[PDB]
Amino acid sequence: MSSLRLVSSSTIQAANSQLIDLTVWDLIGLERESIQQGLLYHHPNQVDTPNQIQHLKHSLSSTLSFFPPFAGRLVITEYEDNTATCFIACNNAGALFVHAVAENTTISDILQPNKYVPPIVNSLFSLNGVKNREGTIQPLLVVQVTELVDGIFIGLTVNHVVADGKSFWLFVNSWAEISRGFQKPSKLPTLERWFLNDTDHPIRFSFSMKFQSGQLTTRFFHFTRENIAHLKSKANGEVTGNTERRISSLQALLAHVWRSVVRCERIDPQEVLYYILLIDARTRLIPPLEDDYFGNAADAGVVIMKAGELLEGGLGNVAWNMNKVISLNSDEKIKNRYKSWLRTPQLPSMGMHTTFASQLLIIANSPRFNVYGNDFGWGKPLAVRSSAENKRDCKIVLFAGAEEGSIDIEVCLPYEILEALGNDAEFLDNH
Numbered sequence: 485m486s487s488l489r490l491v492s493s494s495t496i497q498a499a500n501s502q503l504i505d506l507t508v509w510d511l512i513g514l515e516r517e518s519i520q521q522g523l524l525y526h527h528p529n530q531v532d533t534p535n536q537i538q539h540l541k542h543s544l545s546s547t548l549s550f551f552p553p554f555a556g557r558l559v560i561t562e563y564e565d566n567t568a569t570c571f572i573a574c575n576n577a578g579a580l581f582v583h584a585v586a587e588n589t590t591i592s593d594i595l596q597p598n599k600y601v602p603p604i605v606n607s608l609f610s611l612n613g614v615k616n617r618e619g620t621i622q623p624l625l626v627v628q629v630t631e632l633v634d635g636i637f638i639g640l641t642v643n644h645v646v647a648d649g650k651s652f653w654l655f656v657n658s659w660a661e662i663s664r665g666f667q668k669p670s671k672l673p674t675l676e677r678w679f680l681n682d683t684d685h686p687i688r689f690s691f692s693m694k695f696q697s698g699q700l701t702t703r704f705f706h707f708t709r710e711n712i713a714h715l716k717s718k719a720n721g722e723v724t725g726n727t728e729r730r731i732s733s734l735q736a737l738l739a740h741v742w743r744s745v746v747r748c749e750r751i752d753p754q755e756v757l758y759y760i761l762l763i764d765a766r767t768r769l770i771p772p773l774e775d776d777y778f779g780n781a782a783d784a785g786v787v788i789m790k791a792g793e794l795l796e797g798g799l800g801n802v803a804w805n806m807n808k809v810i811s812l813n814s815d816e817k818i819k820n821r822y823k824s825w826l827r828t829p830q831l832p833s834m835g836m837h838t839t840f841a842s843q844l845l846i847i848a849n850s851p852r853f854n855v856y857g858n859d860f861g862w863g864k865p866l867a868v869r870s871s872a873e874n875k876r877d878c879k880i881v882l883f884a885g886a887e888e889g890s891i892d893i894e895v896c897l898p899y900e901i902l903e904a905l906g907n908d909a910e911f912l913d914n915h
């Protein structure tokens with residue numbers, strides 16, 4: 485029968501102290517979860533596995549020289565007036581490398597296609613359930629490499645106060661480059677983080693003070709470039725006054741997914757619905773941040789619509805509203821939101837009490853991030869998976885698909901809704 489065991493855990497320091505102040509975007513995650521995403525590889529031929537594991541360890545240490553935050557620790561100071569400060573010490577305490585073996589477990593055991601994510605996937609990551617504020621002691625980066633019968637899985641656990649999704653995949657891209665033989669990564673990080681005024685740091689903040697919580701399931705759906713292009717043309721074709729085809733491919737897809745979920749759940753048309761986009765500030769500040777600004781740089785944009793209007797008003801109207809919410813995340817709004825946060829620096833609560841699955845839907849990650857170029861020397865990955873640790877939030881996570889211009893979405897919802905989506909011919913997914 486199949487089994488899973490850890491064979492070794494090793495501290496990995498940078499191959500070759502500095503302090504980093506954290507801004508509002510970074511602090512907001514202190515009480516929340518890590519980023520856990522990983523890559524599946526098939527080994528067509530035999531591989532010298534001990535040498536492969538050693539090569540991943542040494543290239544990881546080399547990459548860490550260029551990303552010192554991932555080898556450091558958080559420093560939190562708690563004060564008597566119920567406030568706190570936090571920063572990153574690049575003290576080279578080290579990341580963690582975990583070597584696991586999944587005896588008699590295969591690629592296809594992990595990647596049940598058109599099926600739900602199997603429970604084994606969650607055990608391909610280490611430090612599940614650890615909040616980002618525990619980075620004062622816990623490594624900010626854990627890599628778990630799990631040997632399979634016909635390949636390996638490379639699963640990263642990354643502290644979400646240090647990095648967002650963009651910065652996560654910057655590190656993965658650069659590590660694969662170093663592993664392939666590059667001497668430097670092709671994109672170097674910008675480590676200095678953004679504050680409206682140099683006097684703002686260290687920010688003194690306060691900690692603290694769901695429908696089907698603990699019972700959600702996770703399933704992938706694949707969207708071809710053609711089906712996406714169909715959705716974009718339809719959405720722009722429905723909103724003509726005042727358009728030169730400004731609704732984007734992703735806006736139309738997300739509008740379609742929103743409509744499909746709500747249609748499958750069958751809810752009262754008077755329900756108010758909240759759709760949570762994460763809008764990058766890097767390109768929207770004036771002056772803009774560096775493209776490879778390393779840290780968090782995104783703010784929620786909340787799309788609010790009645791269920792009746794969402795469905796009866798047509799795809800283009802939903803996508804146009806999302807477009808407009810995105811367009812309101814201007815340089816003015818970003819800086820004023822920052823300033824009012826400094827005036828009431830409380831870390832958020834996870835929000836309202838939800839009574840159905842479509843009520844509050846969070847949209848995470850991006851199809852812009854480079855998933856399939858992560859060749860460490862043995863070929864491109866077959867797939868990307870997350871830990872699927874989250875069983876509380878109704879959530880859609882966006883991934884680049886294997887074929888050019890396609891998108892995989894990882895959907896966390898009640899089981900019967902995922903079943904309805906898989907049986908819905910209006911859901912334009914494939915395979």
Ligand SMILES: CC(C)(O)[C@H]1CC[C@](C)([C@H]2[C@H](O)C[C@@]3(C)[C@@H]4C[C@H](O[C@@H]5O[C@H](CO)[C@@H](O)[C@H](O)[C@H]5O)[C@H]5C(C)(C)[C@@H](O[C@@H]6OC[C@@H](O)[C@H](O)[C@H]6O)CC[C@@]56C[C@@]46CC[C@]23C)O1
Pocket residue numbers: 512758760762782783784785786788821825831832833834835836844846848849
């Ligand atoms: C009246 C309105 C306008 O309809 C109201 C009704 C209520 C709501 C629906 C809005 C609130 O208004 C504000 C709101 C968005 C919350 C506060 C957070 O949002 C941040 O709030 C702070 C202020 O506290 C702002 O300064 C930031 O700009 C903003 O982004 C966010 C994040 C950043 C933690 C977000 O995190 C991702 O989790 C998943 C990971 O996979 C990702 O990687 C990671 O990012 C999860 C959702 C979540 C918890 C919630 C939930 C929804 C809320 C509760 O809208």
